[PDB]
Ligand binder design. Structure first.
Ligand SMILES: [Mg+2]
Ligand SMILES: [Mg+2]
Ligand SMILES: [Mg+2]
Ligand SMILES: [Mg+2]
Ligand SMILES: [Mg+2]
Ligand SMILES: [Mg+2]
Ligand SMILES: [Mg+2]
Ligand SMILES: [Mg+2]
Ligand SMILES: [Mg+2]
Ligand SMILES: [Mg+2]
Ligand SMILES: [Mg+2]
Ligand SMILES: [Mg+2]
Ligand SMILES: [Mg+2]
Ligand SMILES: [Mg+2]
Ligand SMILES: [Mg+2]
Ligand SMILES: [Mg+2]
Ligand SMILES: [Mg+2]
Ligand SMILES: [Mg+2]
Ligand SMILES: [Mg+2]
Ligand SMILES: [Mg+2]
Ligand SMILES: [Mg+2]
Ligand SMILES: [Mg+2]
Ligand SMILES: [Mg+2]
Ligand SMILES: [Mg+2]
Ligand SMILES: [Mg+2]
Ligand SMILES: [Mg+2]
Lengths: 203, 38, 53, 99, 210
RNA sequence: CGCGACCUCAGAUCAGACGUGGCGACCCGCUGAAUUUAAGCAUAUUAGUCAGCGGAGGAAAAGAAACUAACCAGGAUUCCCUCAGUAACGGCGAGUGAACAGGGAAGAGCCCAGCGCCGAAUCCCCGCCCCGCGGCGGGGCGCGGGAAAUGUGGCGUACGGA
RNA sequence: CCCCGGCGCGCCGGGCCCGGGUCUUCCCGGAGUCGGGUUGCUUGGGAAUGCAGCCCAAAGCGGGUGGUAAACUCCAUCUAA
């Protein structure tokens, strides 16, 4: 039951123990490159409850993403339009920094399949995420029925289509009165349905 | 430029390999067999 | 998406089937439709059910 | 290797008791400590991430299980015929070794 | 511009609606495609009922529809438990199961339990191996007569209890439906405030007392 | 000093694999105007639309409730009819604008981590023998190599489970 | 007249040594996530529908929802990351 203790310990992120580990680890992650293959999960309990298994064909990558919002990439701040669209600062990006992290791992390792990721550190400038990827051609993966699903071509670049857990959170999905925007599967699916004129033969 | 996309899209050229795929598809991409000899 | 199709009420469609049948049993109307029925024994013309086979 | 010989010997015996052993793994040792079934817990000094065992010394003390810290997770690895081991535990010993 | 009397209209044609017009000329084609798949499915699963698994009886929510019963999604685990059908075995013999649904009242529960017992009585069960019958399998004489059922299985209907005419009693004549209705609304409206006023008075009187 | 484990990290035309580019009607993720309407115009509208970027598949996405309700209750997702130009939003102007219930199309449900028990009971690769071999797998044998106690496999997952 | 497929029936070598009910004793959950403030966008969502950045930062008869902000109190309904 060690994973029970570790999970609870990683909930005390302002304790003396955990603050010391986060601070020194963030320092160490900061001296490496923005994309860096990790030898093992820094968080074995968090990794495994996100689908990671300790077998050949599962790999970890540590991604560093710059913190903060999204500046509008217009020259000299000119947007050339109406005042409603003059904003340059204080704009936010539609997707989380964790999702950006997974996309940067998924794009680099185009032959792997991103599964999930998790938080490992941050300072004022960077957030650090470890991404769980799978090699879809290792026979430890192809011959396991419980992981054959992610070797299918329909699961190529999940992180790049908002399919991972981090990515799908910015899509406004969910059941109930809070998520009417995406009835039909997505915002555009709801829009097309609500904006298509049904002209029946007999009308 | 829709006009520019149809000047150099798939089909405008030779289809050297794609049009043999279209023929092979109709027989399930069979390989390693021949019609029964005379 | 021109409106190519028309709804006709069922009661009126059946009305139209009844008028067609009533007008089909009158020699004057059938002759006035161009049919050569000057020697048909009777109108309406009923034939035995053997013909169905 | 020698599990194969034990299994084959049982096959011959079938045709014609568990001795004490070290318990390895922070998950196995943890359950044993909580159950008070462990007699002595040996913990590697250089487990990394340290959170894997950072709680174990305090847990053993709460349960009254004697524990020690040893230099080298590789030395505990060599005991269990693996590269590394975070911690091991004695649950039972033979009578000649009780002292 | 408006012209004399008329209605004020706000057509929603201020977008590129012609880029998203859905015509229905494929409607006959869809009807033939769906029909051709119902038939091909009925042949595949024969002699199992073409409609599908038996569905329970449920009451429609809200006050506009709670007078009607319709087919639900699946039988509740309490209904299946009372009828002695294992929940994993239920689907294998054409019974639909809904683990989400709850049973708040007994009548609805017992209505669906009798439904399951009646369905179980009409079930003709072919042995897994044709040549080797087993304990629960139907007899060969009733396997010959087995035929595929069309339409929903044991269709659900709203049946009304006819009440015959009876002599009106003086107690029903003296009942005041409207006065009763108006006073019932008022009591519900003032129930909370009346108790609050009563509680204060008790405290108000108690303080003088002691 | 030397030797040996481990950890972290390197170089190999190392053995065997895999990604790249295209097409893009339909699909998913971003980013994203201004003509235009408001008889002016700045919010608003145009419009989450054009343009731009990324990623797919024969479909995609979604999907088995941290749901709807407030009923005598329903019961994953998607689609059709209706709800409904309605509740609501809006220089409350111009304009915009869903959901639940109800009737249908279809209908299918499941799996981990965790908590535990099982002597790691698990997996990959090499070499030899039999079978198959244009979808590279089945069985047998190796005091063959590695992975894996920093946790593989079997039981089991909220409908409870052991 | 060719070929491909589907559906059936036997042999060989393997794998499984498989379930229901009633009691008894035990066990049971996803965190820089929820939630809150603020900013920007977005929605019919209006003392703030969804999303995102920064700050704060959980609990365990708890947590979320219960379309008007908030305290107290019952209820209903689910079980997020
Ligand atoms: Mg946007
Ligand atoms: Mg899919
Ligand atoms: Mg969130
Ligand atoms: Mg005029
Ligand atoms: Mg090579
Ligand atoms: Mg104007
Ligand atoms: Mg004008
Ligand atoms: Mg102008
Ligand atoms: Mg504007
Ligand atoms: Mg808009
Ligand atoms: Mg475009
Ligand atoms: Mg592109
Ligand atoms: Mg591509
Ligand atoms: Mg393709
Ligand atoms: Mg989901
Ligand atoms: Mg549904
Ligand atoms: Mg109306
Ligand atoms: Mg709009
Ligand atoms: Mg509905
Ligand atoms: Mg139907
Ligand atoms: Mg487990
Ligand atoms: Mg559930
Ligand atoms: Mg969950
Ligand atoms: Mg915008
Ligand atoms: Mg808006
Ligand atoms: Mg309220």
């Amino acid at each position: 039951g060690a994973y029970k203790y570790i999970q609870e310990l990683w909930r005390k992120k302002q304790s003396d123990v955990m603050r010391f580990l986060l601070r020194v680890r963030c320092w160490q992650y900061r001296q490496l490159s923005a994309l860096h293959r990790a030898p093992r999960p820094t968080r074995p309990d968090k990794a495994r409850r996100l689908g990671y298994k300790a077998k050949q064909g599962y790999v970890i990558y540590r991604i560093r993403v710059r913190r903060g919002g999204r500046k509008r990439p217009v020259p000299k701040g000119a947007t050339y339009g109406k005042p409603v669209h003059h904003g340059v600062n204080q704009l936010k990006f539609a997707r989380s920094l964790q999702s950006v992290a997974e996309e940067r791992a998924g794009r680099h390792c185009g032959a792997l399949r991103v599964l999930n990721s998790y938080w490992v550190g941050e300072d004022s400038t960077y957030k650090f995420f470890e991404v769980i990827l799978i090699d879809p051609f290792h026979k430890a993966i192809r011959r396991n029925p419980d992981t054959q699903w992610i070797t299918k071509p329909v699961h190529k670049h999940r992180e790049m289509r908002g399919l991972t857990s981090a990515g799908r959170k910015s899509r406004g999905l969910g059941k109930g009165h809070k998520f009417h925007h995406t009835i039909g599967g997505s915002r555009r699916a709801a829009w097309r349905r609500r904006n298509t004129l049904q002209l029946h033969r007999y009308r | 430029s829709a006009k520019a996309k149809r000047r150099n899209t798939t089909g405008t050229g030779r289809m050297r390999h794609l049009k043999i795929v279209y023929r092979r598809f109709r027989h399930g991409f069979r390989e390693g067999t021949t019609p029964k000899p005379k | 998406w021109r409106r190519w199709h028309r709804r006709v009420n069922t009661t009126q469609k059946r009305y139209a089937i009844c008028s067609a049948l009533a007008a089909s049993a009158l020699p004057a109307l059938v002759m006035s439709k161009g049919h050569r029925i000057e020697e048909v024994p009777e109108l309406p013309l009923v034939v035995e059910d053997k013909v169905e086979g | 290797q020698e599990k194969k010989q034990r299994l084959l010997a049982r096959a011959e015996k079938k045709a014609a008791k568990r001795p004490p052993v070290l318990r390895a793994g922070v998950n196995t040792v943890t359950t044993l400590v909580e159950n008070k079934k462990a007699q002595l817990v040996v913990i590697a000094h250089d487990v990394d991430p340290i959170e894997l065992v950072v709680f174990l010394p305090a847990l053993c003390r709460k349960m009254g299980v004697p524990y020690c810290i040893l230099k080298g997770k590789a030395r505990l690895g060599r005991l269990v015929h693996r590269k590394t081991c975070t911690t091991v535990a004695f649950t039972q010993v033979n009578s000649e070794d009780k002292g | 511009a408006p012209s004399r009397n008329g209605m004020i209209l706000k057509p929603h044609f201020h977008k590129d609606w012609q880029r998203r017009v859905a015509t229905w000329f494929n409607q006959p084609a869809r009807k033939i495609r769906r029909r051709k798949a119902r038939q091909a499915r009925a042949r595949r699963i024969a002699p199992r009922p073409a409609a599908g698994p038996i569905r329970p009886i449920v009451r429609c929510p809200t006050v506009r529809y709670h007078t009607k019963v319709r087919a639900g999604r699946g039988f509740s685990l309490e209904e299946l438990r009372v009828a002695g059908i294992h929940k994993k075995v239920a689907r294998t013999i054409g019974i639909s199961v809904d683990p989400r649904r709850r049973n708040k009242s007994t009548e609805s529960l017992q209505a669906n339990v009798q439904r399951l017992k009646e369905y179980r009585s009409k079930l003709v069960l072919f042995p897994r191996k044709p040549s080797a019958p087993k304990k629960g399998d139907s007899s060969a004489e009733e396997l010959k007569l087995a035929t595929q059922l069309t339409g929903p299985v044991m269709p659900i209907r709203n049946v009304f209890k006819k009440e015959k005419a009876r002599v009106i009693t003086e107690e029903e004549k003296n009942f005041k439906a409207f006065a009763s209705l108006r006073m019932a609304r008022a009591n519900a409206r003032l129930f909370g405030i009346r108790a609050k006023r009563a509680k204060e008075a008790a405290e108000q009187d108690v303080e003088k007392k002691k």
